[PDB]
Every structure is written in structure tokens, then in C-alpha cells.
Amino acid sequence: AKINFNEKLSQLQTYMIQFDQYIKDSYDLHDLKIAIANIIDEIIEKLKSLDEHYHIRVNLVKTIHDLHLFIENIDFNKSGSSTASWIQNVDTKYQIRIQIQEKLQQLKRHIQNIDIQHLAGKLKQHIEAIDVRVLLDQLGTTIS
């Protein structure tokens, strides 16, 4: 029984060492990230080329600006529910609608800063930043 246990334990230790080796050597996923980033950059170039040829982003920025201006322009002075007009005017003399318009304009500027190129760049940053090989090395040197 002692011999059987010793043989089995030595075999299990050898299997664990081989498993660590296999973990270390199995890193083919790392190849994918670089290719994904490359294609993302290619498409960033392509998209910016297309926009420069068809005014898509200029028109979209104008659309966003005008939509936020319309949201700003909504007047509650004329609105029904008479108290609405009174509250609106009391706000008018307390620059509260000015604060509402400032918030709307800040949101408008931020949204107009949300660009397809920015999204692609952030996605490429996320893909390239992490390396699976570091995680594999950590796994092979911790669990034992």
C-alpha cells in the first residue's frame, strides 16, 4: 500500500508539473488581440476617410446641437397647469433655467464629443492593454 501511494503521488506531482508547463506554453490567444487592433485601426482610417467624403459627422453634430437647443427652448411659461407658468417665471428670475440650459449644453458638447473614431480607439486600447501571457505566467506560478 505504501508503494502504491508513493507511486501515485509521484505520478500526480509529475502531472501537475506538466500541467504548469502546458499552461505556460498555451498562449495562442495573444496572437488574436494584435490582429483585432490592426483591423480596428484600419477601420478607423476607413471611417474617417468616408466621413470626410460625405459630411456625415458635420451633419450629425449639427443635428445633436439643434436637438439639444430644442430641448432647451421648451417654454413652460405658456404651458397649461397655471402653476407651471408661475414656477417657470419664479425660476426665470432665479436663473434656474440658466442652470438647466448649462447642463443641457454641457451634455450636448459631451455627446458631440462621442465619436465613432473615439469608440474604436478606446476598444483598441482595451484589446491591446491586456496580455493573456502575463495571466498564464501568474497561473503557472501560483496554483501548485
Swiss-Prot record:
Described by its record, this protein's role is as follows: Apolipoprotein B is a major protein constituent of chylomicrons (apo B-48), LDL (apo B-100) and VLDL (apo B-100). Apo B-100 functions as a recognition signal for the cellular binding and internalization of LDL particles by the apoB/E receptor.
What do we know about how this protein assembles, alone or with others?
Answer: Interacts with PCSK9. Interacts with MTTP. Interacts with AUP1. Interacts with CIDEB.
Q: How is it modified after translation?
A: Palmitoylated; structural requirement for proper assembly of the hydrophobic core of the lipoprotein particle.
Disease affiliated with this protein: Hypobetalipoproteinemia, familial, 1: A disorder of lipid metabolism characterized by less than 5th percentile age- and sex-specific levels of low density lipoproteins, and dietary fat malabsorption. Clinical presentation may vary from no symptoms to severe gastrointestinal and neurological dysfunction similar to abetalipoproteinemia.
Q: Which residues are glycosylated?
A: N77
What's the protein name?
Apolipoprotein B-100
Q: Which residues of the full protein are shown?
A: 2163 to 2306 of 4563
Compartments, record wording: Cytoplasm; Secreted; Lipid droplet
Upregulation: Up-regulated in response to enterovirus 71 (EV71) infection (at protein level).
